Amino acid sequence: REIKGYEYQLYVYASDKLFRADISEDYKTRGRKLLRFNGPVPPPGSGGEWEIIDIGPFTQNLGKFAVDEENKIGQYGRLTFNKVIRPCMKKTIYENE
Amino acid sequence: REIKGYEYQLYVYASDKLFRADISEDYKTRGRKLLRFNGPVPPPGSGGEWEIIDIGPFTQNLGKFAVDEENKIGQYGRLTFNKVIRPCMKKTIYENE
Numbered sequence A, B: 001r002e003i004k005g006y007e008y009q010l011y012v013y014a015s016d017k018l019f020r021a022d023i024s025e026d027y028k029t030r031g032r033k034l035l036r037f038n039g040p041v042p043p044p045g046s047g048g049e050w051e052i053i054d055i056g057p058f059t060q061n062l063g064k065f066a067v068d069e070e071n072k073i074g075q076y077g078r079l080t081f082n083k084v085i086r087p088c089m090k091k092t093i094y095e096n097e
Helices: A057-073 B057-073
Strands: A003-014 A017-026 A032-038 A051-053 A081-094 B003-014 B017-026 B032-038 B051-053 B081-094
Touching (some): A032 B032, A057 B003
Antiparallel strands (some): A003 B081, A017 A032, B003 B017
């Protein structure tokens, strides 16, 4: 159907360290935003599959953690946690064999 | 094999607006970090599949954008872009039908 935009997930080396970065790109305006840039991270190849998990108490508490931490940053003002909705995804990251 | 940690991807309502949040959780220490919190975002159900794309010039330029934007933030000091490595993932987000 009609395209709203794109999201990209990158592994990027910067200053010889590896980072994960996510970028949004609007379709109509082509405007880009950095959504995530974290690391250093392990190289790819040691992650499991993304699996959808339930939205029970453990998952709701992950949402509270996210809101508490975002409130420390302040990008979106003072937020009040409501709830985590489906889908929630989990991936295991393994050490190198 | 040996578990290093987990990553979670959430859709979280806060102050009645929908956000995407990513959280890391270390296996041994259980320590958590907020990696991403952006929005407001469209509800789930209108995204395509994540598809691995090539790491040619367009993708390298996404890495430069990410590093330039992270340098404005300063969390990791002044970084020098090196390169984007495989895998690079792209998803299309559609408007509501």
